[PDB]
Design a protein around this ligand. Sequence first.
Ligand SMILES: CCCCCCCCCCCCO[C@@H]1O[C@H](CO)[C@@H](O[C@H]2O[C@H](CO)[C@@H](O)[C@H](O)[C@H]2O)[C@H](O)[C@H]1O
Lengths: 48, 106, 83, 98, 175, 318, 51, 70, 57, 48, 98
Amino acid sequence: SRGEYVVAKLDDLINWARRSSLWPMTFGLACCAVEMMHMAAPRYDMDR
Amino acid sequence: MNLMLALLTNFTLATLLVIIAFWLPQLNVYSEKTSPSARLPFSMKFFLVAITFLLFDLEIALLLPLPWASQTANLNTMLTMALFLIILLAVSLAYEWTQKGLEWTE
Amino acid sequence: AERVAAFLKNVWAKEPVLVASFAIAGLAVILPTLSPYTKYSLMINRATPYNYPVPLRDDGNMPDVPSHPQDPQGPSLEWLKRL
Amino acid sequence: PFFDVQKRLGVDLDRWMTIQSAEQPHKIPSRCHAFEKEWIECAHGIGSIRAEKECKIEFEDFRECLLRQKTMKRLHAIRRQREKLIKEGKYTPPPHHS
Amino acid sequence: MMLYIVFILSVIFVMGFVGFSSKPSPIYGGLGLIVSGGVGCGIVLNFGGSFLGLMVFLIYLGGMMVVFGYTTAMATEQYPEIWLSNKAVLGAFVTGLLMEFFMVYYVLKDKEVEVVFEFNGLGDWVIYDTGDSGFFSEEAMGIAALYSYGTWLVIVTGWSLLIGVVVIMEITRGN
Amino acid sequence: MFMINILMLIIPILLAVAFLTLVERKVLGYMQLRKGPNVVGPYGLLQPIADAIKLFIKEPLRPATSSASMFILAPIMALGLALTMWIPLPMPYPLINMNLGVLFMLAMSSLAVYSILWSGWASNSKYALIGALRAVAQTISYEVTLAIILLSVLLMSGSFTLSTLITTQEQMWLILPAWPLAMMWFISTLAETNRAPFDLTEGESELVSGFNVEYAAGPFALFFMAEYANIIMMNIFTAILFLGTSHNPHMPELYTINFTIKSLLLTMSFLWIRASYPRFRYDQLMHLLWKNFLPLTLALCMWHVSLPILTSGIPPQT
Amino acid sequence: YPTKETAHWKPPPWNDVDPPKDTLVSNLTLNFGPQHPAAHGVLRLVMELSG
Amino acid sequence: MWFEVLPGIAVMGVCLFIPGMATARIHRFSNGGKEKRVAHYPYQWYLMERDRRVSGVNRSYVSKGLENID
Amino acid sequence: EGKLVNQCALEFFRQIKRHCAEPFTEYWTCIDYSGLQLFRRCRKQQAQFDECVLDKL
Amino acid sequence: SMMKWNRERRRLQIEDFEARIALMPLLQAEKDRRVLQMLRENLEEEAT
Amino acid sequence: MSMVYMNIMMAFTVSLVGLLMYRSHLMSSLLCLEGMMLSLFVMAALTILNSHFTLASMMPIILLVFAACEAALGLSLLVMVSNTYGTDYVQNLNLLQC
Ligand SMILES: CCCCCCCCCCCCO[C@@H]1O[C@H](CO)[C@@H](O[C@H]2O[C@H](CO)[C@@H](O)[C@H](O)[C@H]2O)[C@H](O)[C@H]1O
């Protein structure tokens, strides 16, 4: 029951939550925004 | 007693969730940022929708006793006065409608 | 007439919601005066006993007042059982 | 009323709600029904100048029923006296009363 | 202490009144009135006025006070001065709570105080009615009677509300 | 014992809200020919947990609020009232059995508009306040029909007691005698809770809808939980009101199972509708209320006052 | 009867109308962007509104 | 497939089912295996208070029948 | 007169305890289950009690 | 359907109200004795 | 009188003093006006409920309805004042001095 262990497992939890719930702000400036929209579209479904 | 306990519990939890929602982020110790009456102008139309809601809402106060009113022996009087109230509520709407009180065009 | 029927056609085409609203309200104001069962609503409301029925002091000449609840005299609810 | 249209036309616009001993829905009586009835009947017809003197007993009882000022004074005296004796240990509540 | 629920609520009722009567920024004035209204409904409930109490919440708080706050936002305040940060507002607030505190002190200690009227401090429960076993709510029966006994009341009340719609449209047209 | 009962209501409410967020994303996903969350936990069952943790350890937003007290009061009011709306619901037995439970629910919901108003006041932004006022005007407008529609249905029930609606529908769902009122009721609940196609607070016509605009707000999670608790509660109320479930006193759990299914299906229909339609303009949803629902609701109120009298079908008072 | 405390008083307007000079500024100016920048992103719309 | 939406719905269903089931069971636990008494009107409360006196244990849900008659 | 109300009631219940206790006990135990003490939930046990008192009393 | 069911509910209400009426004399007799006993008891403590 | 009346009567007195002692916002004075009505509603309801004056149970509703309608009229005037001057300050309403 060291502090290194608890801090290690708490890091994994918050890291898991943050990467598992990434909310993007897409700054669609030009053509690349179209491909970004195809990443949300059904074939790739970024929401999943 | 039970209702008071329920209200106290519901708003107590809501309060705790609010303060911990405001304190828990301070665990991160994020860096400092250092980088940021009168009319509104208010439209008369938005004031008039609120007032119309109020006056219609006052007439609804008078209609709430209708379920109990139907238990009376004087049903003819009760039905006449019930329809009278609802009709005047309709007449208020008709007056508002035909003087363009329900428009949103400027 | 036929002017009247044309007018009812124009509103039914342009303002069906208001036509329905005035039709429903018109029935609300007319049917109660025509219904034969309206009289029963008054009778049922008067047959509901909210208060204790205080007995009368028997002077000796009230033939139509029952002495016991199960005696024949007094108002009957036979019409209500069938209704 | 300034203009007694109600009495002339024999139509009851607002008299039905003026007193608490008038007819109520389902014959629910007000708490002071008897007192108000007695005061109204005493003072009826004789005018207010006479009534303020000749129906004083009825009106005083009616007012006592309404606001219970003398009943509360008597209860307060007993309760004040009682707690005085309990402080001095010269009185003990009975099994009932506890 | 639960046996003095009505009195305790009425103390909070007065405190809320001293709130908005010292007249802080209208935004917080509405808050004092909303709290007073909610406490006011509570007092009415404890006298057996369930329907009357809920009308306060539905019509006074959910209706009138919503419109007040709506109007305050559009026509009056958008940000407020800190409550009790003004000399007169704070002095008025302190004065009110001192008067309330002393009224409460003497009424509880002497079980009676006297200002214009004579007030008794035994407890509001002592005046209650000791006979109740009907199969209905007397309050509800009285309110329901509006449509049978109160024909005349309905007509004038109905006319006034209709005229209110007309008048307010006249007033606000501006020409 | 009662304290256990309260917690056995509050905690499941918060869990249903959490997992409704997952159901919404997956139902909307499949109607859009995709899946929605299926990576974070099996079938995305851990996705609500990841979102919840993420939101609560996120930095608070800027700018600072105009009123600290109103900034804190708005979320407390929203969530406190949301939970309070559940205490009289008969499922089949209520936590609090009120004689005037229907009126209690009307009264409490009319207070939910204050959190909108206070959060607009505390936003320190002129444009954000104007957005809040438009939301309030929408909310109160549709409160008019909800109250009048509710009054019309109770003329068949006979009282304001929520559990009396169960007895009223012992033979038949009230949706059959009152489907026109049910239609307008259901839409009013959508507009009342600012749900698509009435979600103009989340629309493109607001002065603050611009992405680059900023104003004091939050916490986002608490407001979101309050809103979704009201969606479920309104749909529970809709089921009780129009789709009454039969109650067997010796098997209350059967009521609860059947009653839960109907509420779930109605809640799913909110998600169904959000996937299907474009958004109303603000003036058009005002027109829908004031010039369509309200005239028809007044007429149907006249009808439902008259109908029991003329058919000799006045319900009992007790 | 003129006094020092009424010196500033002047007769009212002949037709009772005082000029409207206080506050009349009802046109909002809104720098408008798109709700979501996923598609447009680079549109700036300086709009002047009236209600 | 669409039936992968059901697991999240099942979780929602269980959460919504619990408050109703809990209230019913807690009521019967606290009122001697019977439904909690409903007293909306003074007459019903009057009888409940009478039962509390008649029980002899200060609980209105303890019923005394003909065994108390004599 | 109030005392005579009690004595009549006691003699009334003694008649039930004498001839119809078991059907009556079943009937009021069903009534007691309901939170509203509803008659309409117990028509089967009511019929058994009504039949007993008609035959025996 | 609503009409038939509400007629039956009105008949059921009359049955419930008549059960109360049958019991009111017994309840009234008890209440009077209870009230008079409490007043007599208060009086005894008042004398003391 | 009972103890509760003391506080309800204090609340009316407090809101009346608040009404008669203006500051600047006309809105703050209208709230005091609504406060007066709230205290009247409560005192009326307590008197009527405690006395079992059945038909008078409707009176507090009529009070509330008419007072809210009068509050709508007051708010409308405040908005028209705010339109003329851009604030609801009462010190701008001094033209009629002359
Ligand atoms: C114990 C439970 C604790 C509480 C847990 C709460 C978890 C919340 C998870 C939310 C999951 C994401 O859900 C999704 O969020 C976005 C907000 O970014 C919403 O998005 C909506 O609102 C935002 C504004 O607020 C708009 O910009 C957007 O256009 C609109 O679609 C979606 O309507 C919703 O479906």
